[PDB]
């Protein structure tokens, strides 16, 4: 196994994966790391299973059909894998925690959103749909592009949406297009 977390590429107490290399700290796994289950397989080798059990789910897809696709469990860990992926950049330290607003001249958003909340939000079985975690997680970065107007911070929205985008696109074998 790996001697660093795959998520924050820190050491520390680690839980080793049982069918591949990686390793987790408990709650950089997503969801957190399960308290027996020998074997333990992480959420890399659960995504290869679903994708090996039914090779057509590659096939592209349309957006609007996928985010309409209730949150059954192949879809709940679809979206925890991909909230996983964006954690796993250190850009996303910023989106991670529950943010304030006093900038002169900016106004916060109407409706703030980061991370952790949707952590638990998946967590808790919140969202009924897959539209309801994209719509979250876009809204992270729309509050932030917003708040931060000019100033060149707000490129750290663009670069994890980005991240965010194309493991969204890989994730749910979305379409390619031009
Ligand atoms: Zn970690
Ligand atoms: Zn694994
Ligand atoms: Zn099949």
């Given at each position: 196994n790996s001697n660093i977390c795959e998520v924050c590429n820190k050491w520390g107490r680690l839980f080793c994966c049982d069918t591949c290399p990686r390793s987790f700290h408990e709650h950089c796994h997503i969801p957190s790391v399960?308290?027996?289950?020998?074997?333990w397989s992480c959420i890399f080798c659960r995504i290869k299973t679903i994708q090996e059990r039914c090779?057509?789910?590659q096939s592209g897809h349309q957006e609007s059909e996928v985010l309409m696709r209730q949150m059954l469990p192949e879809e709940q860990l679809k979206c925890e894998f991909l909230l996983l992926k964006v954690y796993?950049?250190?850009?996303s330290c910023f989106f991670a925690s529950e943010p304030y607003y006093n900038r002169e001249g900016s106004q916060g958003p109407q409706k703030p959103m980061w991370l952790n909340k949707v952590k638990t939000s998946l967590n808790e079985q919140?969202?009924?749909?897959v539209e309801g975690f994209v719509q979250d997680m876009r809204l992270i970065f729309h509050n932030h592009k917003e708040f931060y107007r000019?100033?060149?911070?707000t490129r750290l929205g663009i670069q994890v949406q980005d991240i965010f985008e194309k493991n969204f696109r890989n994730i749910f074998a979305i379409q390619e297009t031009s």
């Open positions: 399960e308290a027996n289950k020998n074997p090779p057509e789910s796993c950049d250190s850009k919140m969202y009924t749909r000019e100033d060149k911070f």
